[PDB]
């Protein structure tokens, strides 16, 4: 049995590992990553006064897997032809390559679609870049005072065909993740006001619908007034089309002062899922599949965090989650009996709850 | 200056502590409560096969408070007169004392109407009774199988005077702490999984009004689905009125199978503080004040906790923060300039996203 692992981050090395260790020599586990390195620092960084502390961890795929029993090779899936069981990729040194599966896990997770916004390589800067994040620590301390907006960008989410679970464990959404904006706007305030520059700064969060939308009316209306409170503005409806250097402007064609815009760019499917059977992928690119992972067309294909169509919003945890359930499913395929934990949709982001 | 402080859980203690730390010898702080001891369990208990953690702390505030320059004594108050800044209480003796304060600081909590609730005394299990925990654990072993109802009863939340605080802090609860309903809902279905006795217990959860109201319709209809799936019944709007050997009723005289009732009781305010001065108290018992925890109507008074009227839900993480707010506002009146911290709203309870 060979088993392909797209991906290199929480979906596929939770699948691999959690696979691996279950079945042994019972099946060959090959993951194919676009990258030899996987890099997993902390979701939104620690803007202090002097103290920038640095806390990255970097994986060698090329070492750490084997080390497991798990093979590896780096190269770009460009497709999966999911009806003859063929996943398609280019290797580094630009040769093309094709490896038949018996069963695949897709851990390639989604895509930030920067390229949908007008002026964001002269003037952007992006909450889930790697190092440029780093970009905005020295803008923010340089940063003498004016307008700053942060958001995040509209989510294409898919909706057909529709994933096999229960009713309303799939929810929609106007943003993929929405909840680090919210900690995001607080940070910033807080950055300004020990720096006494809260009369400098004009802080105003833009959502591309209503602005945490797991919450009720009210727990919304109350963030709002957090907001009022601090000085702080909220435009709703907002999804950024263009980034100028003074400003970011809508569809519509409505705009909002921004000399620092901090954007969470939009969620698009991953162009390789787009690019693969027509019929394993939803309208938005993501794989639709049961509560076990499974594809609902292609039984021999599991989908695993991001490139699910049901992880909503986009969470790490829900990348792990299903990245364990697609591996006892399998595992229990390959005849060694084992529990299949239950997948729970999450309800509500606790980074809504300002106590957190 | 005399200062009183009223009660000795999360909020009394966090103010005294707080105040006396802050200001020394600048005030005499003293705490009166209705006994000598605390006790500071978990709040939902660990319902485990053959596994019973116990992991409880007991404070004796006589010896614990005077530690830290803090007087104690022993009292029941009966009621407070803000006009004349005086405070009634019963001592141990049965005698009836009453004493003067420059300030006061009201940390008696709410309370449990368990009394609404005929056949409590009876047919009862308690979420929030001491060793009531105790009563359900050898219950729930020794369980053969059955119906079981979980929810709470309703909260009677006041509504005049309004507290001095931004618009939308303060949410309208049916009930006033909703999520260990949730989660016990979980750790119920988990035990019986685990006996292998699913088809021989009967989950039913009971909400007073449109349970976890903090959530979108979208995530309350998620929540739907989890207990379909979990085999739980869910019946909103049911407002507990009796507990019979074997079912529970509401006002309207409905029914529900229960030959386990679990009951988080009814919220009202704190009988001592409904017979405290007219116009300190809104019309549910509870101390409407502004963001400084100081009383709308009489400077000298600071309510904290679950005795002021903006904290709902009912949390004990929004009494420390009180707590403290109402003992730094308290040290820059007498003197020592302190930084009071920005009170906010909870939006929502983690406990209601099941990954918690
Ligand atoms: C951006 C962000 C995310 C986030 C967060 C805050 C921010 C600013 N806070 C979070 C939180 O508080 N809690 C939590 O659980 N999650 C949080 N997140 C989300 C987290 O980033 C994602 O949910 C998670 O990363 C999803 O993991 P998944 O493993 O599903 O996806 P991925 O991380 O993108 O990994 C993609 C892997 O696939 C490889 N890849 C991509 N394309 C290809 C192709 N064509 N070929 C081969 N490999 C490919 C990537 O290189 C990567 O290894
Ligand atoms: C019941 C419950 C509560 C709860 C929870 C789960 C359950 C089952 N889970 C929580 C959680 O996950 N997180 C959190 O922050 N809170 C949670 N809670 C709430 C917590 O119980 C309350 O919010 C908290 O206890 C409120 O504290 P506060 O200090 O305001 O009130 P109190 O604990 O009732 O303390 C009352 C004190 O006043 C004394 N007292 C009462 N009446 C008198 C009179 N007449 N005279 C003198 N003293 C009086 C009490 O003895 C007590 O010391």
Known sequence: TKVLVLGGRFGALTAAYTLKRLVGSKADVKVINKSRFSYFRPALPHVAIGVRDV???????????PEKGIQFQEGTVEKIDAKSSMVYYTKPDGSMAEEEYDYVIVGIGAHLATELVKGWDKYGYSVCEPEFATKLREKLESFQGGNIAIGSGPFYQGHNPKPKVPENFVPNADSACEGPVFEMSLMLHGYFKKKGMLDKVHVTVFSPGEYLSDLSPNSRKAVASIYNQLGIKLVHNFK????????????????????????????????????????????????????????????????????????????????????????????????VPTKVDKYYPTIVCVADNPYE
Chains 1, 2 share one sequence.
């Not at 806390?55 to 897997?65: F, G, H, Q």
């Not at 899922?273 to 594809?295: A, E, R, W, Y």
């Not at 021999?300 to 299903?322: E, F, H, I, W």
């Open 55 to 65: 806390d990255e961890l970097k994986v060698d795929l090329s070492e750490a897997l």
């Open 240 to 335: 950024i089309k263009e980034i100028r250097e003074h400003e970011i402007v809508d569809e519509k064609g409505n705009t909002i002062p921004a000399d620092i815009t901090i954007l969470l760019p939009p969620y698009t499917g991953n162009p390789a899922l787009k690019n693969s059977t027509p019929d394993l992928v939803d309208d938005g690119g993501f794989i639709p599949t049961d509560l076990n992972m499974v594809s609902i067309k292609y039984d021999n294909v599991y989908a695993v965090g991001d490139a699910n169509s049901m992880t909503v919003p986009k969470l790490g945890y829900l990348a792990v989650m299903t990245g364990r359930i697609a591996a006892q499913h399998l595992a229990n395929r390959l005849g």
